[PDB]
């Protein structure tokens, strides 16, 4: 049932390639946690990686072109044109901290069993759908609109349309991971990706260290700024 679903999803992703597992990670008990939980973790992590890579590709385009919000906010400290690796280099340190904290809050909400069991769902390792995000409906104070469908125009979708959407999501995620690390590899070593030679400048700081080259400590909050 686990590997059979995995074969079916791989066949729908690509009829020619099909199931491609040269490393055989779909047979390894990752924590002594059977087969169902291991493939659920693998699918959830693949889906999360693909979504983050698609968002990162779009954000890299936006910062490399120069697409600032406006005034007052953290965009005011970032210089006008510094390439996308250096826009996570000039925002204040507390902005990076609070961004990573909000991402962790979103991950925790996506994993908290109260949120999942609120809208009738279980954990992806325990038997839930991988990549699913519970709406908001346990968070003490009410939330205005959900995260998957903020305006809820996808509520009429058929299950076949949802399955095709998941397959397209996975394929686009894989290809966006490849493209985004094409960008990051060309920003580190020249001549890796031949197409991106000369477009992306070289960067010296570490990409895998978040607070390396940490930003300044400025207070952008006006009106009653008792935290000087």
């Amino acid at each position: 049932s686990a590997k059979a679903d995995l074969e079916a999803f791989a066949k729908e992703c690509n009829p020619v390639v099909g199931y491609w597992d040269p490393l055989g990670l779909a047979d390894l008990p990752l924590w002594g946690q059977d087969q169902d939980a291991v493939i659920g973790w693998l699918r959830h992590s693949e889906i999360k990686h693909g979504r983050i890579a698609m968002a990162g590709f779009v954000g890299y385009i936006a910062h490399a072109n120069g697409f600032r919000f406006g005034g007052i906010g953290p965009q005011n400290v970032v210089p006008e044109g510094a390439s996308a690796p250096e826009v996570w280099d000039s925002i204040p340190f507390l902005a990076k901290l609070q961004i990573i904290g909000a991402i962790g809050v979103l991950e925790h909400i996506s994993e908290d069993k109260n949120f999942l069991a609120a809208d009738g769902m279980k954990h992806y390792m325990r038997g839930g759908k991988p990549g699913y995000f519970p709406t908001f409906s346990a968070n003490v104070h009410p939330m205005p609109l959900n995260l998957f469908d903020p305006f809820k125009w996808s509520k009429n979708a058929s299950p076949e349309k949802k399955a095709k959407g998941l397959v397209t999501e996975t394929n686009n995620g894989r290809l966006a991971m490849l493209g985004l690390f094409g960008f990051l590899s060309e920003s580190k070593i020249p001549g890796s990706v031949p197409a991106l030679s000369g477009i992306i400048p070289s960067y010296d700081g570490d990409y895998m260290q978040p607070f390396l080259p940490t930003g300044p400590d400025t207070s952008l909050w006006t009106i009653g700024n008792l935290w000087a």
């Binding site: 009829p15 099909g18 001549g191």
Partner: protein, 224 residues
């Protein structure tokens, strides 16, 4: 094919005949594709040496490097012309040929077409057509194909197809000795292929001069 020529029979001095059928199909497809590449190399080298330099490269071909196709064509023998092409051009050409090889090797496409032996064994010499269902589905309808793109071979009897495959094999042999007599004649040697024939590269087997990443190899001077 037992014997196309009745006066030749089966010449197997090395004894590679009378072996496993997988090896038989492997050798048959190797000979067929060797002959096809040999005939393509024959016409390509003859056209390149005679001089049919295409009126092309009007912006975007080598705009940054400033290299017209006439400058590449004015290099001598076709081996020198191949040794004068840029690294992206050679890499993308080899990638296109490799992708065609991957499609010719693919098991699901061959078995959906109606063939067998995705080692490229049984039905030797088949290239899958790039159309219809469950292949090349993501955009790219591919109105043309590889073999019979204009449908010149639309109707053929099995006897005519077998005779044309025998013609394939024999003409591939003839052009294979032809192209190697000709490249050896370019490198001195040979029986008598003077025919100007310009100059020669190192061996024509390097397939990647003046490249980057691992091409810091001065080893093409020796090996006797």
């Amino acid at each position: 094919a037992k014997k196309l020529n009745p006066t030749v029979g089966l010449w197997d001095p090395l004894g590679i005949a009378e072996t496993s059928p997988e090896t038989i199909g492997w050798f048959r497809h190797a000979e067929i594709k060797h002959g096809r590449v040999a005939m393509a190399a024959f016409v390509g080298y003859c056209v390149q040496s005679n001089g049919i330099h295409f009126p092309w490269n009007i912006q975007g071909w080598q705009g940054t490097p400033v290299v017209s196709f006439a400058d590449i064509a004015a290099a001598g023998g076709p081996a020198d012309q191949w040794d004068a092409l840029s690294t992206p051009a050679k890499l993308q050409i080899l990638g296109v040929i490799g992708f065609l090889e991957m499609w010719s090797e693919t098991s699901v496409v061959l078995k959906a077409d109606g063939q067998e032996h995705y080692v490229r064994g049984g039905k030797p010499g088949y290239f899958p057509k790039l159309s219809r269902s469950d292949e090349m589905a993501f955009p790219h309808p591919v109105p043309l194909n590889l073999w019979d793109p204009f449908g010149f071979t639309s109707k053929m009897t099995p006897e005519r197809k077998e005779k044309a495959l025998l013609a394939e094999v024999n003409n591939g042999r003839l052009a294979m000795i032809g192209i190697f007599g000709m490249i050896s004649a370019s490198k001195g040697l040979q029986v008598p292929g003077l025919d100007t024939v310009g100059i020669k590269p190192y061996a024509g087997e390097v397939m990647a001069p003046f490249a980057a990443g691992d091409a810091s190899l001065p080893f093409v001077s020796g090996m006797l």
